[PDB]
Amino acid sequence: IPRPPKHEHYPTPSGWQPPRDPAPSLPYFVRRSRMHNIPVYRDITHGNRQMTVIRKVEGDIWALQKDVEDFLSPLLGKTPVTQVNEVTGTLRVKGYFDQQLKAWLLEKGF
Amino acid sequence: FHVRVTLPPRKVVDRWNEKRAMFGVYDNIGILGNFEKHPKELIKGPIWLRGWKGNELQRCIRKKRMVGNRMFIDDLHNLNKRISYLYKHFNRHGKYR
C-alpha cells in the first residue's frame, strides 16, 4: 500500500486528515489502519443490537474508556454501556456513534 | 468385566525421536518462502485427499471421479452402493427440514 502523498492543504477534499507529527502526550494510543483511516466501525447483531467498535488500541485502555464515557455523557445524559477487552485491545460501545467518535479521535490526533 | 491381573510393560515413549522433534517444521514454507509452495503441497496420503476436506458423501463422490477407473471390480460396486445410500439418506431423511 503506497503512503499517502503530501498535500499542501489539509484536510483533503475527501475528508482524510493525516496524523499529527508528534505522538500525543496521552497514555493510550490508537494505531491507524493499513488504509490510513481511523479504526472505528459499526457492528450489528440479532438484527437489533447496534454497537460501535474501536480497534487497535495500545496502552492503558481504561483511560480510553473513561475519556469516552464523559465525552458521550452530555450527548445522551447517561454513561454509555461499554465493554473493555484488554486481551485484544478493543473498546465496544453500545449504539451507533461511529461518526462522532471519528471526529473526536481526529481532533486528538490519532 | 474381569480385568487383567498383571501390570503391563510400561511403554517407554521418547518425546525426542526424529519424528516428534522435526514434527511440523516446514508448515510456514509459503509465508517465509516468497509464496512458492502452499502448505497443502506437503500432505502425504490418498491422491484424492491431498488438500481437500468434506463430509462422507462428497468424499465418496470425489474418490469415484479421480481413482474410479483404477479400482477393483468388487470395490467399484461397494462404492456405488455407498453413494446411493448416502444420497437417499442425506436428502430424503433427517429431522431438520
Partner: protein
C-alpha cells in the same frame, strides 16, 4: 506499551502443556446419552418426526403449496443475459486520489482502478465494466482523464468542470477478462486479440456525443461539452492550453485493448521482450 509483557517474566514458560482456547469460542457438543438427552434423543414420539421421513421442503400436506399457487411472472426472465455495471462514486474516486491509490498524472482506465483496489470486476457474472455515478459531484476537485463503460450527465459535468476528459468504451467479456487481469493473461502464452464491437443494442449509446462515446464523431464533442457547461452554469476550461494536454488526449483504437500495445503481439514476460507478427494475413486479420 504492552504492559502484559512485564507479567510474563514472573509467570512460567509458555509451552504446549498450558494452552487454553478463548472462552466461548468452542461451544461443547451434546450427545444423546443420559437421562436428559435419552430415550428420545430429541426427536419426538412416533410419526414422521421420530422416524425421520417427513416430506420435502415446501410441502404443506396435500394442500397446494404456497410456491405453486402463485402465477408465473417474469422477474428473472433473461437475467443471465442482462448487462451489469459496477458503480463508482466520485466520493470514492476522490478518496482514491487523496491516498495515492491512483494518480491523475497518468491516464486512468479500468485496469488502473483494479490495481488500485477501487473496484472489483467479475467478468463471469455478466459485468460489462464500471459506470460513473454522481454521488460526490459537489466535492470533486480532481482533474483526471478517466475512461469508463457508462457515465451519467452529472458525473460528466462534474469532471469537465475541473477540466477533465470522460470517455465511454465497450468491452466484450472475452476482452474484459483480459483487461481486468492482464498479468494472468500474459502467462497464458496467447496473442492479444482484437476488441469486439458493441452489439446492436448498445450502438446508439456509444455513437452519440452526449454520452462521450468512444466511437462518436469527435467534431460534435466541443458543442456537446459547451451544452453541459451552459446547463450547469460553469465556465468551460480551455483544455488545449494545459501542460498535460498530451496525456489528456490519449485514447485507444476501437480494436485495441491496452495503451500502446497492438493485437497480435505476444508478451514474453520472462525475457522482457515483445513479439510481433510478420505475415500479411496475420497483420491484416489483427488490424481489421
Amino acid at each position: 506499551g504492552p504492559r502484559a509483557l512485564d507479567l510474563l517474566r514472573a509467570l512460567p514458560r509458555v509451552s504446549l502443556a498450558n494452552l487454553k482456547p478463548n472462552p466461548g469460542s468452542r461451544k461443547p457438543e451434546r450427545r444423546p446419552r443420559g437421562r436428559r438427552r435419552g430415550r428420545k434423543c430429541g426427536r419426538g414420539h412416533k410419526g414422521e418426526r421420530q422416524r425421520g421421513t417427513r416430506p420435502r421442503l415446501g410441502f404443506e400436506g396435500g394442500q397446494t403449496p404456497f410456491y405453486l399457487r402463485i402465477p408465473k411472472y417474469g422477474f428473472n426472465e433473461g437475467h443471465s443475459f442482462r448487462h451489469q455495471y459496477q458503480p463508482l462514486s466520485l466520493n470514492r474516486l476522490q478518496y482514491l486520489i487523496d491516498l495515492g491509490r491512483v494518480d491523475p498524472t497518468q491516464p486512468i482506465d479500468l485496469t488502473q482502478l483494479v490495481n488500485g483496489r477501487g473496484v472489483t470486476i467479475q467478468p463471469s457474472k455478466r459485468d460489462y465494466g464500471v459506470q460513473l455515478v454522481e454521488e460526490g459531484a459537489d466535492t470533486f476537485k480532481a482533474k483526471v482523464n478517466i475512461e469508463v463503460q457508462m457515465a451519467s450527465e452529472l458525473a460528466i459535468a462534474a469532471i469537465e468542470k475541473n477540466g477533465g476528459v470522460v470517455t465511454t468504451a465497450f468491452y466484450d467479456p472475452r476482452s474484459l477478462e483480459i483487461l481486468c487481469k492482464p498479468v494472468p493473461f500474459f502467462l497464458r502464452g496467447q496473442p492479444i486479440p482484437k476488441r469486439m464491437l458493441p452489439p446492436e443494442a448498445l450502438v446508439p449509446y456509444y455513437t452519440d456525443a452526449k454520452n462521450r462515446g468512444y466511437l462518436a464523431d469527435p467534431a460534435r464533442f466541443p458543442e456537446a461539452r459547451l451544452e453541459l457547461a451552459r446547463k450547469y452554469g460553469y465556465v468551460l476550461p480551455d483544455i488545449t492550453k494545459d501542460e498535460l494536454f498530451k496525456m489528456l488526449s490519449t485514447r485507444k483504437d476501437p480494436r485495441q485493448i491496452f495503451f500502446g500495445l497492438a493485437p497480435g503481439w505476444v508478451v514474453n514476460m520472462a525475457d522482457k521482450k515483445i513479439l510481433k507478427p510478420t505475415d500479411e494475413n496475420l497483420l491484416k486479420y489483427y488490424s481489421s
